[PDB]
Symmetry: C4
Amino acid sequence: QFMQNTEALCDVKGFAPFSKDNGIRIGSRGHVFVIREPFVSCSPTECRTFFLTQGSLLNDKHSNGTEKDRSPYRTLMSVEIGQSPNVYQARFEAVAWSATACHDGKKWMTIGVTGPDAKAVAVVHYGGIPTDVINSWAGDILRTQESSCTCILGECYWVMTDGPANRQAQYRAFKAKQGKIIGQVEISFNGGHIEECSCYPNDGKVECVCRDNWTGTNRPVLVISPDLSYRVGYLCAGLSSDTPRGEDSQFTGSCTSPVGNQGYGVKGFGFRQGNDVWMGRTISRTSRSGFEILKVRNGWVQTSKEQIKRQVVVDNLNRSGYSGSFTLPVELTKRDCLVPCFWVEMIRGKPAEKTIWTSSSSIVMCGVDHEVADWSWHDGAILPFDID
Amino acid sequence: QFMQNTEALCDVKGFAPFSKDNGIRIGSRGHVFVIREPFVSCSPTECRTFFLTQGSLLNDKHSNGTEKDRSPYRTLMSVEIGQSPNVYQARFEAVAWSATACHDGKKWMTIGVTGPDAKAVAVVHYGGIPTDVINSWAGDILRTQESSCTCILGECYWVMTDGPANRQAQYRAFKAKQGKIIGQVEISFNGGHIEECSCYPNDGKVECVCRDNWTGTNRPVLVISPDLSYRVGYLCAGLSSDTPRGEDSQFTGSCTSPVGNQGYGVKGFGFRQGNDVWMGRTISRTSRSGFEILKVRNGWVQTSKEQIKRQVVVDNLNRSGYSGSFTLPVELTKRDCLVPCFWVEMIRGKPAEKTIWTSSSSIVMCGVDHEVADWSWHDGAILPFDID
Amino acid sequence: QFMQNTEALCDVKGFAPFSKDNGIRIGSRGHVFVIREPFVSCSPTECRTFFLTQGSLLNDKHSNGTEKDRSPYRTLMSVEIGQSPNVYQARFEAVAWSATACHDGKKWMTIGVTGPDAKAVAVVHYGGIPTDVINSWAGDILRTQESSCTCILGECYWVMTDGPANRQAQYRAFKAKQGKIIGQVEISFNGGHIEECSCYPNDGKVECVCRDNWTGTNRPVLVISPDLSYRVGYLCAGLSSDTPRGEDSQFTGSCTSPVGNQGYGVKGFGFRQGNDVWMGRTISRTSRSGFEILKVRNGWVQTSKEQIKRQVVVDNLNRSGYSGSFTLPVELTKRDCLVPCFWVEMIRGKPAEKTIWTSSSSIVMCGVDHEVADWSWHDGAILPFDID
Amino acid sequence: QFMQNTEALCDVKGFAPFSKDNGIRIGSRGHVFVIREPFVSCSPTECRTFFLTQGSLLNDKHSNGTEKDRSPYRTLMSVEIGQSPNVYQARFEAVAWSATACHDGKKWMTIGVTGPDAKAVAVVHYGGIPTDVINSWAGDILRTQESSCTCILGECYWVMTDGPANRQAQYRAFKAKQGKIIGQVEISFNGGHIEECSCYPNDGKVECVCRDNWTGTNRPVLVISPDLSYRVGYLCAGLSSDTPRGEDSQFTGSCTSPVGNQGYGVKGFGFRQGNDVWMGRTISRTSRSGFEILKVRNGWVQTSKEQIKRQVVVDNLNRSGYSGSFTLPVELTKRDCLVPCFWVEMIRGKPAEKTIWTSSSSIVMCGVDHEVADWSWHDGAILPFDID
Ligand SMILES: [Ca+2]
Ligand SMILES: [Ca+2]
Ligand SMILES: [Ca+2]
Ligand SMILES: [Ca+2]
Ligand code: NI
Ligand code: NI
Ligand code: NI
Ligand code: NI
C-alpha cells in the first residue's frame, strides 16, 4: 500500500543518535567506496543510506581526486543505514552525479542526473528500472536535492535547478506517480537562489529548506501543495544557518529576501515545529566545521532570535559538511505524527587535509521527546592513509 | 505466473543510462572477477548482469591470460544490474565458456556450454539445477548467444551454432519449457553465417540480430515464431553495423545476402521499430572503439540510408566491445509494450593494452520517449595495474 | 505474534557446543571488526551475535587501542550466530558503548548507550529505528547488560546502572512494549553492587545473575516480575563465581550479602534449575583464564557446596572473558520449556599479550539432556599480528 | 511440507556438469576458507555446498597445516552450490571435525561431531539451533559420513562409526525427526569396515556405498529401511572402486566379503540402477588422481565386469579426492524420479605439493538422459602461493 504521509510532523525536544557508519575508518583496510553526498531515506520496512561513488575505493589509486566532479563514472548506490558504503553490501541505484531518492510505500523511486553540463539527462527509476526522463531545460547543469525526496499519497515530489551556481538560475518542482512524471511547476523566485533542497512531509505538504548560493546567508523555504501550487520565501528566523555567514549579532532576518550579501553556501536543513523551527548549521561561520541544531521560538513565521534549545552533534574542532532531512514513516514508528530526522556528512581529505582523496562519513539523528546532551560523533579517521 | 511477453516492442526516441558497474576501477583494490561476455536479462522483479569468469580475480596472478578461452575453469555467474562482478555478491549459474540466460516469469533458465571442442555439452539449468542437455551435433565448438534468451508464454527460445567460425556452419533454434527442451529447428542459411545472436520479444515472436563472421559486414536477422517456423535474412538497412566494416559511402544494403566481403565481426544488436530500426555499432570501422546507436527510417524492410536519430554512448577515443539486447517486462514497467534496452561491453587489457590480463565493464541503456544527449560512459580504469 | 516466553526453563544435564566464530583467526587476513562484549540473542527464526565495534578492523592501524573505551565511534552491530564479526555480513544496530538486545516475537529491540559520561543517552531501537530514550539519571556512566534482554508476552525487560564502578551505585529495571518505555523501578540494594546483568526468562519472570564490582566475589541475583515488583539478593551457593575471588575452601555463601571483600569482577551468568543452579566461572581465581560450568545441588536456595556436575569449556591455559545467558525460544525448539544457552568471550591482545590491539571471539553452548565431555574450544589465533 | 523422497532413483545414461567453484584459484587473492570434506545437499529451493573450515584463510599464516585434523577451531559452514567457500557468503552450521547435513522439506538438519577423541559429542542441529546429541559409544573417534544424509517422509537417516580406523570398529545408523533422535540400530558387520558412507534415497530406502579402511578394496553397501531393519554387504561388481586397489585384471568381486587385502581407502560413491550400478573411482589405483565413473551391467547384484559406460570427469594428470552422492528433489526437477548427482573433491597442497597448506575445490555432476563427453574440470590453481 502507498504511504499516506499526510500527518503532521512531530514536535520534538531533542535529537537522539540513530546511526554512525565509520566508513572512512573502516576503509583504511576494508573495501569502501570513496563517496560524496550521503543522504538517508526510509521505506515502510527500513532506512537506507544513499551515496554517490566514482567506482573507486579508499586507499586505491583511483581515489586520486583528479577527476571531474560530474564524471561518467559517478553512480548512485545504497546500503542499510549505519553500514559503511562498502562494495559488498552495496545496491546499485542509478548513474548519477546528482541525485534524490524516496519510497512511496510500494517501491523506491530514484532520480539520477548524468550526462554533459549543457544537456544533462535526469533518469527516473522506479522499482529498480528506468521509467522516465527529464532533460535539461536551461542548458546549465541540471541538478537536484542530494537528499530524500518526499512522497505523499503515492505521489513523489522533488525540486531541481538548471542554471548558474552563483547568480539567478531557474527552479522547478516535479511530481511523479509510479516513476512517471505527471506534473511540474516553475518556481518564480527573482533575486533568490535555490540549490540542494532538504525536504520533508508536514500536514500533507512538502516543506523544503534549501541553499542560496548567490547572495543569501539565510536559507530559502519552499512549500509545495499536492496540486503544485507553492509558497516560496526565506526562513524567517533572525539567525542565519548557511555557511559562510556573518555573526549572529550583525544579522536581521527576512521572510522574503536574501540577507548577508555573501556567496557560496552549504546544503542544510530546517524543520517547522508549529510556528517554531529547528535549524541546523555548522558551528564555524566560515568553514564546514562543527554542527549544531537550534530551536527558535516562532522562527518559521517571525524574524525571531529567541533560541530555546541548542544541541551540539559535532564539535567545532572536527569537520562537518552537508546535512539533510528525512522522516520516519508511521508504518515503522506507529506514531500519530511523522518523526523528523537528519544526517550530517563529515568530509575528510583534500584540499583541507593533505591527501590525494576526499570522502565523507555520516552521523544520523532522530527527533525524540527528551532533551539530549551535547557531544561529538565526529568521523574519527586518522589521515593520511597509505595511498597518500 | 509466466510472463506473456506477447506485446509489441515500444517505439522509442532515445536511450537513457540505466547502469554502469565500474568493475575494473573497483577491482584495482576490491575482489572482482576477470570477466568476458557480460549480458543483462530481467525477471518480473529485477534485472541481472550475467558474466563469464575464469575463477580468477583482477590484480591476481591467475588473471594471467595464458589460458584457453574455452577452459574448464570458465563459469557463468550473475549479480544485480550495476553491481561489479565481485566475488561476494556473485550468484553461481553454470559451468560455461558460452552461455545464455532468461527468466520465464517463474524461474531463471540458464544454458552453459562446456566440454571439449569436438564434443561440447550444453547444460540447461532451470531454477538453479540442471534439467536437460544438448550435445554438439556437428563436432565443432557448440556455442550460443552470450546475451539474454527470450521467453514468450512460458516457453524459452535461443539460437546455437555448431561448425566453423570463418566459413559455413550450422545453426539451430531451440525451444524449452521449464528447463525441458521440447522443440528445435535447423536454420537453413546457405552462404550466410550466424553467431552470437541478440534476441528480444516483439509481437509474440523472437527477433534476432546476429553476427556474420564469414563474409558479411551487415548483420543476419532471424525471426522465430512459437511453432519454430522462421524467417532468416540480413538486416536490410543501407548502413552496416558489424566491425570490421567498410565506409558507409561504399555500402549498399541487402535484405537477403551478406555484403562487404570481410571476415570477423563483433556481437551487436538491432531493434525493429515498426518498419524502422535502431542499430548499434562501434564508431570505428576497424576496431572495437566507440559506440553509437542509429535509427534508420524503414531500415528493417528497405535498404534505407535515411538516418533520423543518432546517439553516442561511448566516444571514439575509448574502447567498446560486444553489445546485446534485452527487454524490460511489463510486470516492472506497467507499460502496454516491451521496453528495449541494450548493454555495451567495454574491453580493457591485452593485447591492445600492455597488461597480462583482459576484462570488461559495462554500460546499460534503456529506451525512453525523449531524445538524450551524446556522452561517453567509458570504462575509466587506469592501466596498467599492480600485477602488471 | 509475540513470543510468550512464559514457560519454565529446561532442566539440563550438560551443554553442547552451538557455535564458534573464529573471528580473530579469520581477521588475520579477512576484514573483521575489532570487537568487545559479543552476546547472543534469538528471534523465532534465528540466533544472532551482537557486538561492539570501534569502526576499526583487525590488522589495521585504527585497531590501535589508544582510544577511550566509551568513544564516539563505538557502535552495536550483529551477524548470524557463528559468523565472524566481519564488515560485509554485519547489520548495524545502534550507536553504543554499552548495549543490550532482544526479540519480542515480532521485531528486534536494541538499546544503545552513548554520549558523555556525565549525561549519557540510551537510545531504544525497535524494528531498526529509534523509538525512545533514557537519559542518565545519576550523571555517572549510564550503562546496561552487554547481553540479551528478556521479552515476556510482548514486553521487554532490562537492567541499567548509573553511578560508581567501585562503590555504591544506583540500579533500575525497565519495561518496554514495541520500543516504548512503559515502566521502570528503582532497585533497592544497599551495600550491594549490580553491573552487567545476565538475564533469562523462567516461569514468567526475568531472572538475572549479575556482577558486583564493589566488595562481592559472589554474584547478585535479581528476579523481576512483570508488574516490576522484584526480589534482589546474592546467589546463595557456597561457591563463588566472580573473578577475582578467593579459594573455594575459604568461602561461605550468603543469600543476602556480598562475601569475599574483593573489588573488580567479570560479567558472568547462572541458571536456576528448580532449587539447583548452573553457574559459570573462570577456572583461574585471579585472571580471566579458562571457563567451567558447575551444577550445585540446592545452590539457588541454600549455601550449598554440593557440586553434582562440572564441565570444562575452555582450558585454564587459554584466555576467557565475559560470559552471558540467553534462551532458545519454543518456536525454534518445539519444546515445552525454554532451553538455556550461554556464550563465552575469549579475549586476546593487550595488555596481557604484546599487541597494540584487543579483540575477542566466542564459543556458544546450549543445554542438552546428556552429559558432555570436557574440552577446550579456545580462540586459536597466533599473536602477534602483522600490524604489531 | 516434508519431502517424500519415496520415488525410485532415475536411470541415467551420463552425468552433466552442475557446478565448479574455483575456490583455490579465487583464494589466491580473495578471502576463502581453507577447507576439507566439501559435500553437497539440496532443499526444495536450492542445493548448498557444505565444508569443514579451520577458521583460517588461504594465503594467511593460520593456513599453516601444523594443527590437529580434529581441532577445536574446526567448524561446518555452507554456501550456495558453485560459490567458493568464502568468508562473506558463508553460513555457519555447526562446530565439527566430522559432519553430515540434509533437508527434510521444512528445515536443514546438520550433525557436527566435535570434542575429544575418547569422548566426542555429535550435536544435531535443526533449523539452525542445537536440538539433540549423541556421545561416543565406543570411545574412539565418533565420526560420520562427510556427505549428505538422507530424508524420507520427514525422517532423516545417517550412519556413524566409533572405533579403530584400521581394524574392526562399530557402526550405527540413526533416525531423527525434526532434529530429535527417535531410533538407532547397531550394524552387524564382522570382518567388514564402514567409514564415510555416501547415501541417497531409492524406492523409499536409504542406499549407502561406503569406505572400508581395513582390508577391502571393494566398497561396503548398506541398505536401510525406515523401520531400521537393514541389509549390509559389499558392492557385488567385479571391478573395485576404492583407492588404493589392485588391477582390475587381478580382481574378482564379492557380494559378501572384503576383497584385495589392502588397507586405507578414500570416500567414494555408487548409484544403483535397477540391477546395474554407476560407480565412481580415481583413475589412479595408488593415488587420489583422476576421476572416472563407470556403469556396470548387473553390477549391483552380480560380480559383473561388463562395463557399458565410462565417463572421465578429471584427467589422470590432476588431483582428485573424496567423492559423494546426493539427489535432486522432485520439488525442483518436477520429475517422477530422484535424479542422482555426485561431487568430486580436488585436493591441493601438502604433502603431495610443496606448500604449508592443504585445501580443496569441487566439481559437481548430475545425471541426465544423454551420454556426455569425457573432459577434465580439474582444480586449476597454480601453486605455490604467496604464503609459501
Ligand atoms: Ca549562501
Ligand atoms: Ca562480419
Ligand atoms: Ca566482584
Ligand atoms: Ca580400503
Ligand atoms: Ni533490516
Ligand atoms: Ni533489487
Ligand atoms: Ni539462517
Ligand atoms: Ni538461489
